[PDB]
Amino acid sequence: GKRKRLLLLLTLLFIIIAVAIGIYWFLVLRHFEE
């Protein structure tokens, strides 16, 4: 239950980190055809 609440909590941090990395890599590839 609470362990379950922290199971969803830790998962959310990773997801947000990935979403934030997605913008940086987006801008990087968009400004240069390599």
Instruction: Kindly list the residues in this chain that would bind other proteins in the complex (CB under 8 A).
Output: 1, 3-4, 7-8, 10-11, 15, 31-34
In whole angstroms, how close is the CB of 24 to other proteins at the nearest point? 16
CA distances from 2 to 5, 7, 8, 12 (A): 5, 8, 10, 15
State the Cα torsion 7-9-13-16 to the nearest 10°.
110
In whole angstroms, how close is the CB of 1 to other proteins at the nearest point? 8
- Complex with other proteins: residue 4 or 23, whichever CB lies closer: 4
In whole angstroms, how close is the CB of 19 to other proteins at the nearest point? 11
